[PDB]
């Protein structure tokens, strides 16, 4: 058995392993999410598609349950482990209490795992950041965000990855109860919020929307293509 | 400059710097004083001034009906040791339906404290103690050390600046046996007054007093229960 302290304190009370994990998550592809009136949407950037892949196998937007979905930035191999553990937890909760989970319940579970890997012997921290969205039985949309340290908040709209430093300033100024009225209004909002960070031009973006019905619907390339023309 | 990190490395002079440092930890604390007469043993401690608003501390704890201790050093380690001593006395009374001799208790404590000092990736308990008890053979004032060896003494003081209390103690040890309880306690409070700097005298809430004896269980004296003892120290 391997029992060593990998992440330990430092002069001035820093955790260098966690700081390095965050410096790593600061290099992924940008993700953006907003919370609508009756809809929730996410959006991820594709650095390059390479003209030879199969996009069905490199998707960064999964579905943990009927009403919960997520999108990450960082390291895909770690993201996969976290996602599968969250799926098993959702099934256990359904089995024991006879009701689908809340968004905050699964956010707490994920954050607890991430924190546990910062204080155990013989482990390094996870190198991913997640954005979790969904609806509940009340009919209230939610949007959260976790960190490699185990801390999570609730936000109106947020952006993770590289270029988030400008996506956040853009979204701060432009977010208002007017761009929220309708789905084809919020979706164009998200698209123009992502486009000024995509310096390639055009659509190198994946965009998934989730409404109270027809869950985790994913916009087709042609459909997403139409919106870009409308903006211009 | 490579022998001062692990507890399992000897120096070219046959010393263990880690055990040393763990002792220099014990010197940081506030002074204590113990002593015994023909029929009673006594502990007196000086609760340190933490801040302008907080209740001072707990420096004297019950171990059993006849045993009590007083600590100086890491309080977490101190109460970790106190739990072990309490379980020892409880186990004794369960099996033999009688109390425990203070000497056998201190033997168990030393044997337990020694093991960490030898293995890799472990550190010594950073706390010194002062035990007081009554038994068939009379009082006892044992003292322990971070390095697991313990002593037996008529009167001993541990803590910062306790050199003066130790000098006073030996200089006046000639009469501790015959002296009465009131006389015995005052001898303790004077000795404890010695270590304080010039700007402070014993008040009524920065001192504690423990007492065990022939026909009397171990008792601790509260903030204003120590008033009948500090009335004469002119």
């Amino acid at each position: 058995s391997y029992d060593r302290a990998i992440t330990v304190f430092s002069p001035d009370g820093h955790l260098f392993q966690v700081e390095y994990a965050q410096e790593a998550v600061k290099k992924g592809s940008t993700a953006v999410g907003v919370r609508g009136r009756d809809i929730v949407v996410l959006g991820v950037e594709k650095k390059s598609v390479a003209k030879l892949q199969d996009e069905r196998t490199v998707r960064k937007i999964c579905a943990l349950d009927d009403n919960v979905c997520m999108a990450f930035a960082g390291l895909t191999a770690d993201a996969r482990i976290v996602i599968n553990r969250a799926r098993v937890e959702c099934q256990s909760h359904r089995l024991t209490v006879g009701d689908p989970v809340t968004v905050e319940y699964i956010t707490r579970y994920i954050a607890s795992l991430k924190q546990r890997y910062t204080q155990s012997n013989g482990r390094r921290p996870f190198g991913i950041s997640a954005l979790i969205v969904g609806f509940d039985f009340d009919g209230t949309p939610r949007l959260y965000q976790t960190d490699p340290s185990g801390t999570y908040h609730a936000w109106k709209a947020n952006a993770i990855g590289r270029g988030a430093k400008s996506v956040r300033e853009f979204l701060e100024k432009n977010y208002t109860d007017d761009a929220i009225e309708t789905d084809d209004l919020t979706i164009k909002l998200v698209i123009k919020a992502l486009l000024e960070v995509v310096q390639s031009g055009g659509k190198n973006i994946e965009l998934a929307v989730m409404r109270r019905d027809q869950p985790l619907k994913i916009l087709s390339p042609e459909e997403i293509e139409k919106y870009v023309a409308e903006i211009e | 400059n490579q022998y001062d990190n692990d507890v399992t490395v000897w120096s070219p002079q046959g010393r263990i710097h880690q055990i040393e440092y763990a002792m220099e930890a014990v010197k940081q604390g506030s002074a204590t004083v113990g002593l015994k007469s023909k029929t009673h043993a006594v502990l007196v401690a000086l609760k340190r001034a933490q801040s302008e608003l907080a209740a001072h501390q707990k420096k004297i704890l019950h171990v059993d009906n006849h045993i009590g201790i007083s600590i100086a050093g890491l309080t977490a380690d101190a109460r970790l040791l106190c739990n072990f001593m309490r379980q020892e006395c409880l186990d004794s009374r369960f099996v033999f339906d009688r109390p425990l001799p203070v000497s056998r208790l201190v033997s168990l404590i030393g044997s337990k404290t020694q093991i960490p000092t030898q293995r890799y990736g472990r550190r010594p308990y950073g706390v010194g103690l002062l035990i007081a008890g009554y038994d068939d053979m009379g009082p006892h004032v044992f003292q322990t050390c971070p390095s697991a060896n313990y002593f037996d003494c008529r009167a001993m003081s541990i803590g910062a600046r306790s050199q003066s209390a130790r000098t006073y103690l030996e200089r006046h040890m000639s009469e501790f046996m015959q002296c009465n309880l009131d006389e015995l306690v005052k001898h303790g409070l004077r000795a404890l007054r010695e270590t304080l700097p010039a700007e402070q005298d014993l008040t009524t809430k920065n001192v504690s007093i423990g007492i065990v004896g022939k026909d009397l269980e171990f008792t601790i004296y509260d903030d204003d229960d120590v008033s009948p003892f500090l009335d004469g120290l002119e």
Binding site: T96, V97, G98, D99, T102 | -
Partner: protein, 201 residues
Amino acid sequence: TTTLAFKFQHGVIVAADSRATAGPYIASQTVKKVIEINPYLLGTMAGGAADCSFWERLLARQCRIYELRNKERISVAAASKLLANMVYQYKGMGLSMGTMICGWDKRGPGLYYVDSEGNRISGTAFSVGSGSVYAFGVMDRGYSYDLQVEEAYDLARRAIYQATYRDAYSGGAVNLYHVREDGWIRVSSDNVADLHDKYTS
């Protein structure tokens, strides 16, 4: 032992007797067979008294911890599931139980029956014990969903009274509770002897 419970228009009604026996000797004559789990839940006691009491105390503790963690109360379905799961770990070791959980949630009146075997079923009228077959004959013939509170009270009292009149392991007093939207209340603790003169001449 005789316990009953039936949902109706205005919530749930619960009743019981109070005698406990070891063989043919009546040890106690006023036990409490309704177990107040919290201000908003309640169970009932039939089978082994020690098993009943112990496991419903465990359940009360877990409901409190659920509330503290999730900032919301548990529901009747979830509480029944927790109890059934807890006792399924000791199947075949000799536990003796059989209980009823009643309460109100966002879905209205709830009435569940959990056993030592491991079953749980939703219903509109249950009855447990060794006078259960005597109480059924009166509940089935008097019950109606279009009934109000005092008619329900009278029907429950009459069922328990005739059950303890014909059964040897039932007697003493009858304790009546009532689950409404705003928690439960205690209605009456009349004694079967002072009921019998009322119910005849």
